[PDB]
Amino acid sequence: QLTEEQIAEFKEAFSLFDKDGDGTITTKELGTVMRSLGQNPTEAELQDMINEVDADGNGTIDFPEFLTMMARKMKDTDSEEEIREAFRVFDKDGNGYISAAELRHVMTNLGEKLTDEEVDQMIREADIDGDGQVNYEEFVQMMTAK
Amino acid sequence: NNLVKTEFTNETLDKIQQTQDLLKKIPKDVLEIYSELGGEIYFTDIDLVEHKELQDLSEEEKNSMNSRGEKVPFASRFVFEKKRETPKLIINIKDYAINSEQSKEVYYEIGKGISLDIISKDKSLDPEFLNLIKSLSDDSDSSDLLFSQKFKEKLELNNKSIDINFIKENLTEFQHAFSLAFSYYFAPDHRTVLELYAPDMFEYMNKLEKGGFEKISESLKKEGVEKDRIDVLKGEKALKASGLVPEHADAFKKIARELNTYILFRPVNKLATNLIKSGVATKGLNVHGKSSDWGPVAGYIPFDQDLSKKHGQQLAVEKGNLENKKSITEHEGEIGKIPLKLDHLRIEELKENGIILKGKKEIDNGKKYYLLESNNQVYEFRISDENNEVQYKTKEGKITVLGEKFNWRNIEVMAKNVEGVLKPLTADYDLFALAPSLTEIKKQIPQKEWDKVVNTPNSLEKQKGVTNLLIKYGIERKPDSTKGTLSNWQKQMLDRLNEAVKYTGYTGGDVVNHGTEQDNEEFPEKDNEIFIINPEGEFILTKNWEMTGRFIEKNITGKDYLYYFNRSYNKIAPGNKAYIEWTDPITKAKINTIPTSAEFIKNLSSIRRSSNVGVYKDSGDKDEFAKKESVKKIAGYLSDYYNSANHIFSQEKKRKISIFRGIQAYNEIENVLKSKQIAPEYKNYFQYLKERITNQVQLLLTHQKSNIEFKLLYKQLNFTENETDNFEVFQKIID
Ligand SMILES: Nc1ncnc2c1ncn2[C@@H]1O[C@H](COP(=O)(O)OP(=O)(O)OP(=O)(O)O)C[C@H]1O
Ligand SMILES: [Ca+2]
Ligand SMILES: [Ca+2]
Ligand SMILES: [Ca+2]
Numbered sequence A: 001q002l003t004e005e006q007i008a009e010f011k012e013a014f015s016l017f018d019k020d021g022d023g024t025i026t027t028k029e030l031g032t033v034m035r036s037l038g039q040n041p042t043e044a045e046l047q048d049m050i051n052e053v054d055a056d057g058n059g060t061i062d063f064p065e066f067l068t069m070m071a072r073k074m075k076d077t078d079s080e081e082e083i084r085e086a087f088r089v090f091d092k093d094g095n096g097y098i099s100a101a102e103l104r105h106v107m108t109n110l111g112e113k114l115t116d117e118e119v120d121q122m123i124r125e126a127d128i129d130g131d132g133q134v135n136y137e138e139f140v141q142m143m144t145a146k
Numbered sequence B: 001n002n003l004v005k006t007e008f009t010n011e012t013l014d015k016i017q018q019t020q021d022l023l024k025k026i027p028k029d030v031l032e033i034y035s036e037l038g039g040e041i042y043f044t045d046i047d048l049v050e051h052k053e054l055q056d057l058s059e060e061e062k063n064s065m066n067s068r069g070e071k072v073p074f075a076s077r078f079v080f081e082k083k084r085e086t087p088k089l090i091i092n093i094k095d096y097a098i099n100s101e102q103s104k105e106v107y108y109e110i111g112k113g114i115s116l117d118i119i120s121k122d123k124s125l126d127p128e129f130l131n132l133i134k135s136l137s138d139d140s141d142s143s144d145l146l147f148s149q150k151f152k153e154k155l156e157l158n159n160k161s162i163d164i165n166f167i168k169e170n171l172t173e174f175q176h177a178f179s180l181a182f183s184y185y186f187a188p189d190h191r192t193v194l195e196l197y198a199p200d201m202f203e204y205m206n207k208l209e210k211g212g213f214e215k216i217s218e219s220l221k222k223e224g225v226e227k228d229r230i231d232v233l234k235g236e237k238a239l240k241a242s243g244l245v246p247e248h249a250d251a252f253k254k255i256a257r258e259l260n261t262y263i264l265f266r267p268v269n270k271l272a273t274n275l276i277k278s279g280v281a282t283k284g285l286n287v288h289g290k291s292s293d294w295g296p297v298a299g300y301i302p303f304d305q306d307l308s309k310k311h312g313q314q315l316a317v318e319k320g321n322l323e324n325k326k327s328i329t330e331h332e333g334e335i336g337k338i339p340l341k342l343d344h345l346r347i348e349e350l351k352e353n354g355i356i357l358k359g360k361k362e363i364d365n366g367k368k369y370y371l372l373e374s375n376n377q378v379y380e381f382r383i384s385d386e387n388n389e390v391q392y393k394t395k396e397g398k399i400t401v402l403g404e405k406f407n408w409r410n411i412e413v414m415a416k417n418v419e420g421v422l423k424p425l426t427a428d429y430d431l432f433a434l435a436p437s438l439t440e441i442k443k444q445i446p447q448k449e450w451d452k453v454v455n456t457p458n459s460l461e462k463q464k465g466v467t468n469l470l471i472k473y474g475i476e477r478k479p480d481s482t483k484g485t486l487s488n489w490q491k492q493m494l495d496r497l498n499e500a501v502k503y504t505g506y507t508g509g510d511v512v513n514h515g516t517e518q519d520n521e522e523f524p525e526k527d528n529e530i531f532i533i534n535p536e537g538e539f540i541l542t543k544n545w546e547m548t549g550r551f552i553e554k555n556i557t558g559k560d561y562l563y564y565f566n567r568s569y570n571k572i573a574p575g576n577k578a579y580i581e582w583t584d585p586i587t588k589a590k591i592n593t594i595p596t597s598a599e600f601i602k603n604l605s606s607i608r609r610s611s612n613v614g615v616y617k618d619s620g621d622k623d624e625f626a627k628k629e630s631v632k633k634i635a636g637y638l639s640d641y642y643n644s645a646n647h648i649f650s651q652e653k654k655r656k657i658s659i660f661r662g663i664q665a666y667n668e669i670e671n672v673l674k675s676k677q678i679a680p681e682y683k684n685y686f687q688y689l690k691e692r693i694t695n696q697v698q699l700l701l702t703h704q705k706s707n708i709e710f711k712l713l714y715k716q717l718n719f720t721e722n723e724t725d726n727f728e729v730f731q732k733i734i735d
């Protein structure tokens, strides 16, 4: 049962992208309403939820129909949390940032021998803004981003 | 801690090739001693007189024992020691010369000594027979009454056998001798003069070079940390206030070690410790009555709530009972009530502990009764003889807060089932947390899964894959039939604890019934003192919510151990609407981060539920929509910042392509914030967002070029009609 708080958010976003301010949103729109909320259903998985409620110009969903769809994917997962704990783990030192130094230092205790070369590697591909380190933000990305 | 300090790189490779030649002749340790001693050596330029940034007033000249003879002509010195807390060696050098008449360096050498004498061994642990005895060799050990170099104006005193008798009187004097003994052992010229004259002091210093120095330099090192540590009380000093049952703590001592993991408990109540060792079972999840802290019942969970900590609170009793009753109603067969029975020992304890006072005997219905007394003025208590049952009633002139009035009745305490028999319930051991080592968790994943993951070619994939493993097999906490909400490894850790105190001779069941208080998300409690049992097996008891959060950063957090803290910290806990703070790293860096698309939208949502006015109203005003279109505009940039396709670019670019991305965001914010009426609640949020974007962009600058400031770089753009060259501009804007 999406919590009220968890609702106001799906409207503050559902609406924020309903350009022709009515009360329903296009398919493409739905994709955007989502990604913005931090998610990105496949350019094909994005139609399963919508195709299931074909009582519109066929390709449009109101608010109440979206408030529902946000179940099939959400009435189970509660992983956002754990992933934030993992982060606090590698961030060994406490700088809110995960340095390649520590990426390795932790990667080696869980039994994995990493090359001082291939670590700088990951750390690199994980950083999106260039500071050579990873923060929770980009870390969340790396992880969940399938 | 860099000991040497050269204030002026003036003179050529000669002041330098001279300061060096000096220091390289002193043992790498005499220094490591001076360093740990917080000393610092000062090699400035020419600063003869009190001109050195440290040659002012602090702890200067007071009494005249001064050099390799005394002289106190300050205007004529080049080497100095700031004696009082921390030693400060201060030396200068003029033109090319110390090697011709070395008698000039013998000072920068002794001048030092007084850096380590009085703190050396001479008086450093205390005078220890080592030196003390070596001093006795005034003249009666070796056939060498030669010490006309260190002992004259003060020690031409052969007439009195020098020992503990008077060696203290002149501590400084026995320094003026150790210092030369040192000057001579290292002076780049007169080496043997020592070995030739005084035969002992040589072999003394000699054994100092041989290791003697690496000694103290390790008695200060170790007494370096154990000196500036965290006040925690350890040993059976804490284990006292802790509350745990001693034989139990120790029993635990074993598992911490074997399984290598820190165990942390909240305060177990004192009035229950023995009851526990005694054999009394512990309160589980099934019961929610309040313990009691007075009268006999004390430490037991009375079926009557007006006989526990909440005596008088018409509501917590009138709601306490509601629970006991239900506790039995629901979980019948396991949760019941049984008549109180304070055994033999328990009594003599509520004695001095100051809870009851045994006395005046009495008879009633032909049975022997000892009127147990107390100061509580609402009930009367008394205990049987055959069976030592306990009974009470209201007094002949008073009434219950609930309004009841009853005569002598047995005091039923609460009790759970244990091997078919109901035993009375008392306080249990509530874990504040469990810190297993990251390696023990590795031993938790099945060798084939963790194997099937590191073969993945994709490095980025290998990181993710691993993390979810660590998460999966060691961070994830699910609910559980009996033991509340906890981790799996946590559960196994739970049993090993119980089975542990079970062989220690317990007979009341388990003593750890549920998970770690770091999952008590609903009604989190904040205890000051927290008993701990490290992996080595010591006992520690923080004193503060702080200390704990600190003793943990220092040993559990940043030390290869896996710990996670209450999801409700730094938030208001639904259940009891409580706010318990805990240093969270992630949040410690929000200050310098360009919010997320979704973190942004979320924030608006929030404020909408409070000022009941959204960033933009659903109206027809073409001014509103403008504001709308404009947040959508930020909700765009903001996520554009965190685009995962940033991998195909090079670091340099990343910062750039983003410093901009973010900049665009700052723009549109600025825009709106200079728009129509936007509730002053957003006015602020949006203001807060700025400081961030700013901060984040400044960080993305100090990684690249350095003078460039935000406020400026921004000023220098043109977001009027075209964004075209605006960006190219931005590049050059960085040269
Ligand atoms: N993992 C968990 N699952 C379920 N409940 C948990 C878990 N961890 C902690 N708790 C809850 O924490 C609670 C501890 O709070 P509290 O009962 O106020 O402690 P206390 O100070 O030892 O004694 P009182 O009963 O309050 O006098 C009891 C327990 O149900
Ligand atoms: Ca629409
Ligand atoms: Ca870090
Ligand atoms: Ca980064």
Ligand SMILES: [Mg+2]
Binding pocket: none
């Ligand atoms: Mg409790």
Ligand SMILES: [Mg+2]
Binding pocket: B283, B284, B428, B429, B430, B514
């Ligand atoms: Mg408990």
